[PDB]
Design a protein around this ligand. Structure first.
Ligand code: K0J
Ligand code: CL
Ligand code: MG
Ligand code: MG
Ligand code: MG
Ligand code: MG
Lengths: 194, 194
């Protein structure tokens, strides 16, 4: 019933562009939408985000998160490890790779979502959410070695899965960070379950 | 350590703008980023809300109430939590209840309200409050819920059981071209993981 008629370029950066989308509304009237797209997509999706479950015997199961300065936000954010999928990379391989670079952990793939939208009223950005388990008792994850690329500066924050929401709220209150909406959504559902 | 040095406007549509962001990296070196912002944020503590609406009815399993609509940035239909921007002077809770009623017909009760969470913080400064609302589906008000969509709004309601949310989402993606939102998928994944 609704569909895109045309896309007009408004402005194109190196990494992001702004378009004016013309579309057919369900009444049969033509309407416009200002949209954002990345210039980097090739791929199943733009990026991956990793839900890393750190499993150590005789310890609570932790979710491994990252804290970074985010220039669009003007501040620090707490997020699932994540990055864009390299040209001709699978989402799983991007997931294990980004997890290693950002955290130093070597994980195993548990499951992989279909491409999911980030902010669909604003952009076409999509990611695969990849659930990964980390055997924290293996020697490779003893002294995990994070390999930041140029200009990446990432802090690792592991939080217990069984209290995640309350721990995130604490960091927000105490550290004036912004929690990521996907992280928060995950944390809410852990409390809402059953 | 890191902070914004300058924000230069590149292009300003009516709804969105693109900015060249200059910031100080933690080595003391000046770097740039291409940033997206909305033009609509005034004194709201966030751009928008998204509502987690838990529909509760005697002798029923709890449902999560979702909406499906065409998203011109995505060029297709998306399944999302009910959501909208916060009107000037409106509280996040009022916005949540109002959007829920407009989009679904249901009259909810506030349960909890998150702090401002970021939508896609490597791309944009956009933020939302995630507002959990219970819907008493045994109340007469909520028996024959009719969407009251605004101008150019065309929303379908999809209520799915909480106890099978992920598989029911998978079954919808399997049967048609449609993208699930990353917050909804994250929430459904945690419901499984718990
Ligand atoms: C910022 C994403 N664009 C919009 O919200 C919009 C609304 N009408 N036209 N474009
Ligand atoms: Cl798991
Ligand atoms: Mg990253
Ligand atoms: Mg990277
Ligand atoms: Mg909406
Ligand atoms: Mg609306």
């Amino acid at each position: 019933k609704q569909y895109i008629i045309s896309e007009e370029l408004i402005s194109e950066g190196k990494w992001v562009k702004l378009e004016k989308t013309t579309y057919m509304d369900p009444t049969g009237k033509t309407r416009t939408w200002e949209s954002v797209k990345r210039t980097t997509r090739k791929q199943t999706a733009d990026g991956v985000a990793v839900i890393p479950v750190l499993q150590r015997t005789l310890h609570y199961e932790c979710i491994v998160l990252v804290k970074q300065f985010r220039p669009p936000m003007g501040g620090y954010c707490i997020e699932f490890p994540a990055g864009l999928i390299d040209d001709g990379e699978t989402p799983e391989a991007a997931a294990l790779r980004e997890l290693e670079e950002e955290t130093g952990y070597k994980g195993d793939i548990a499951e992989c979502s279909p491409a999911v939208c980030m902010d669909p009223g604003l952009s076409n950005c999509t990611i695969h959410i990849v659930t990964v388990t980390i055997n924290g008792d293996d020697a490779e994850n003893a002294r995990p070695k994070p390999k930041p690329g140029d200009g990446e500066f990432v802090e690792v924050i592991s939080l217990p899965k069984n209290d995640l929401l309350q721990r995130l709220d604490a960091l927000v209150a105490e550290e004036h960070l912004t929690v990521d909406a996907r992280v928060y959504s995950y944390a809410l559902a852990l409390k809402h379950a059953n």
